[PDB]
Amino acid sequence: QAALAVNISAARGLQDVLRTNLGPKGTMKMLVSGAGDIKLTKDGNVLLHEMQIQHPTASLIAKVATAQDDITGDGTTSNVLIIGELLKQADLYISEGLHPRIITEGFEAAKEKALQFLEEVKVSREMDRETLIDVARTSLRTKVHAELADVLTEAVVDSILAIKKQDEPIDLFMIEIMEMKHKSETDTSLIRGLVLDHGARHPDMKKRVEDAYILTCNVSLEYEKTEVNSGFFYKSAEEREKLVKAERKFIEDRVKKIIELKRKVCGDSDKGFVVINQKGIDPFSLDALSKEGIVALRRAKRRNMERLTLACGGVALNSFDDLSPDCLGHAGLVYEYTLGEEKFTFIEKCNNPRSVTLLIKGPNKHTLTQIKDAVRDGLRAVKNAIDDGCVVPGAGAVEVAMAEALIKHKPSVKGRAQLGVQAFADALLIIPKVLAQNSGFDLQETLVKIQAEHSESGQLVGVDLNTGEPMVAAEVGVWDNYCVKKQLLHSCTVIATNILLVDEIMRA
Template sequence: MVAAERRSVDERVCADNDSNFAVINQKGIDPPSLDLLARAGIIALRRAKRRNMERLVLACGGEAVNSVDDLTPDYLGWAGLVNEHILGEEKYTFVENVKNPHSCTILIKGPNDHTIAQIKDAVRDGLRAVKNTIEDKAIVLGAGAFEVAARQYLVNEVKKTVKGRAQLGVEAFADALLVVPKILAENSGLDTQDVIIELMGEHDKGNVVGLNLHTGEPIDPQMEGIFDNYSVKRQLINSGPVIASQLLLVDKVIRASRNMRKPS
């Protein structure tokens, strides 16, 4: 029975190889079969993770099959280079130079876990920013330029269209938008008041400018390539008044409960 099983496996493994092949399997491959494949010039990788198999299909094309009986040239993917690197104490197999990739892997290296986590967060933020830009098909000027321009528009245009206490609300909302350039200036060690006055002066002249964190001077964000995501900025503007309203509502509830405790 052992000999018959060995013969059956060998028949599946052995084949004439005129091209370079790589076999990647989610399950195990016994050492004799690995040896036979290696003699035929076929790289065999075993115990691959399912998510890696799914990414390989997106990167290289082809399809994953459950049986060698179903294996035909139509199911094969293509890659220009498959090689193995030893990084530290771990072995990594790189599949490179694919023709039409829809997936890729970014290998992050660092001296400690904290550094790797920081790099990973930065990569994720960058990818999400690109994704938002593609979906929104729009961007907003960064470096605090949008907030100062919005503040000027609210004070000079919108405030004139309302009457009574609503004007105070518009003015308060407009001043709240200046928090972003103020924080940028504080984090850069700049004088907040001087920066805001200079930015507002430029906007009054019709120049939509932002803050240079190195020099504290106004800059053109578009020329410097500084932009923010439209969807993120919209969400912040929408959620800000909602959060403020909820906090005020909590204060009213606390005051009401205190008044109810007082004796009549």
């Protein structure tokens, strides 16, 4: 009776808060924390995961929405707008009776009709470079500046078309985003193979490695000593004075094992023996072995070594010795690059060059984070477009045609479910409206123009976010993902039903 009204008000408030974010031309919000550090972002997922919401059921909506749509690429803010509009439209009929179950039946029937419509509208144009360009641009211009997105589209699309050779979509490890703080943010490219965070204390050991062999195996040039005896150095410090010694024999054992490894699998000072340590190493043994042609470094994280297993090769055990070099692999180039003060090791052209890392040079922390999120979103969107193989006309093209199909589907359903279907259509109509409003033009001017021209066009058609003119998104380059639409519709219907079925609230 009134719990429904409370939920409606909370959902409308959340929708109104998230109104001015949809679309590339939409403005962006900024997040402030108690510490003082601020984040500047526009993506709905991070906004809902970071906002401090007052109303409880609004927090419910945000949490469940993020949880469900983590599976698909994005569309979070569009989903929130559609569910808010659904609730408002249902309220305009509930306020005069209209028991929520009938509205639920109408919603489910409209969902079925919209699913069939989307199935028969989806366009299966064969994949090429140009379509990937268009998808990357559409998915990137909605998270970062215009020209920055234009620069980043080429990098992301080239990386993704490189990845696509496996004929199966895989992600996470195979694409790595490195972060650094060069002033020139315009520098953004891709590096094949691996890029290591940093190296060790080596004065011009190998540099241009060219051909190399990778064994790693967490070398022990600074093998752990026996420092821990009882708490700390007590009056009985002879343990931490002498027992801490005699472990240099481990370091010399590793040195000699690498010695015959190098002059067994190489036979010359060339062909850099690439090894890594998970902790620091002593410069003495390090440069003594590097002067023999061994590429030894230190202080690397795990993710790089697991990537080395699949992209370079070689086992990795901290406690080890010389063993079968069968696991060892080869690298085309292990050249090291330094920008200003910190060293980057470019492990590229290696065996299985499928693994590729992405390079950005953001000036400060928040721009770096926004760039990382934008490139991740673009990668996910293009991967989904690869997987479905059938892109769909965006810019509100599918939504308006879906609304028209639902309206023409009104007499098909009996009972009072027609009211639910009509409300569902009017709610799905929100997306082009929000696009036009965020762009700056009048709401209903653009909406009426688009509907009127789509009446005779037959083909799908969107909105140009530069003049308000209707535009055929198919021929321009605006594209969305089939799976995104599927998951959005399904989750939207589910959450709308769940909220509408509530009757009363009590404490606990």
